[PDB]
């Protein structure tokens, strides 16, 4: 079938300067956001954010709304709980983040699940790869670990990730087939600009590609120049495609000694590009 995932990325933030907290959740299939929930919205609901989810009937919207609202309430409580575990002041704002999801292998069969939490930007508690055990970051998280062991939380996560997560994923893939199941290769180009009297900058671009995953590497005589290379973060175009570039300063006159190697799942085979 192919490699694919369904994930939810949730952020709960305490706001003592507003006397409340906020929860936001977003859902993705692969790189494509499809739902959101925002507790600060008027009439907070699970809302569609891709066209191909819009046809879900009201019972889907109602159910997902009940469950995400439930989750918002629990994560708000968790913020208070964690403040207690770390003995933190009431005055400061704190963040609990949660990411969970399922992964299908290259054969379309379930390969991987995950369920993990961070507090104030650092790992707190994570379901291990075996889906049977938990890794706590510190003594606070060990309190939560003990609770979740006693509640057989891992067994409930296994059932969700094997059943509902994968089944939903596969229905989303069908509904969004014309965008989710076809990769678009990068449009590439290599620019050249003298950047001092000593050097010339070669920049290898990839634009217009999806999915986001891509490799751009400069080589000289079959050898990666990744130390000296400037490589920007992959960045979204805003229309479901992505952009990336990689740059290298090379000696004037030596431009043809260097090639940019592009790998992407939309390509028949990898590209070897030169300033041309």
């Amino acid at each position: 079938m192919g490699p694919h995932s369904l994930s939810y990325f949730s952020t709960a933030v305490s706001r003592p300067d507003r006397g409340d907290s906020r929860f936001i959740a977003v859902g993705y299939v692969d790189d494509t956001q499809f739902v959101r929930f925002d507790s600060d919205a008027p009439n907070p609901r699970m809302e569609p954010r891709a066209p191909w989810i819009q046809q879900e009937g009201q019972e889907y919207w109602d159910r997902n709304t009940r469950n995400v609202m439930g989750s918002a309430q629990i994560n708000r409580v968790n913020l208070k709980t964690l403040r207690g575990y770390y003995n933190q002041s009431e005055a400061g704002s704190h963040t609990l983040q949660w990411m969970y999801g399922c992964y299908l292998g290259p054969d379309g069969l379930l390969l991987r699940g995950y369920d993990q939490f961070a507090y104030d930007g650092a790992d707190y508690l994570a379901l291990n790869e075996d889906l049977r055990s938990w890794t706590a970051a510190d003594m606070a998280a060990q309190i939560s670990k003990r609770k979740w062991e006693a509640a057989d939380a891992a067994e409930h996560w296994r059932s969700y990730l094997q059943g509902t997560c994968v089944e939903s994923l596969r229905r989303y893939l069908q509904m969004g087939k014309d965008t989710l199941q076809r990769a678009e290769p990068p449009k590439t180009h290599v620019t050249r600009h003298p950047s001092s009297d000593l050097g010339v900058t070669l920049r290898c671009w990839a634009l217009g590609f999806h999915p986001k995953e891509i490799s751009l590497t400069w080589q000289r005589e079959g050898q990666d120049q990744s130390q000296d290379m400037e490589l920007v973060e992959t960045r979204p175009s805003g229309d479901g495609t992505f952009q990336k570039w990689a740059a290298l300063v090379v000696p004037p006159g030596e431009e043809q000694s260097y090639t940019c190697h592009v790998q992407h799942e939309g390509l028949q085979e990898p590209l070897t590009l030169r300033w041309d």
Partner: peptide
């Protein structure tokens, strides 16, 4: 489909 159980920390 969103999870239908969130656990208390």
């Amino acid at each position: 489909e969103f999870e239908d159980l969130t656990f208390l920390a």
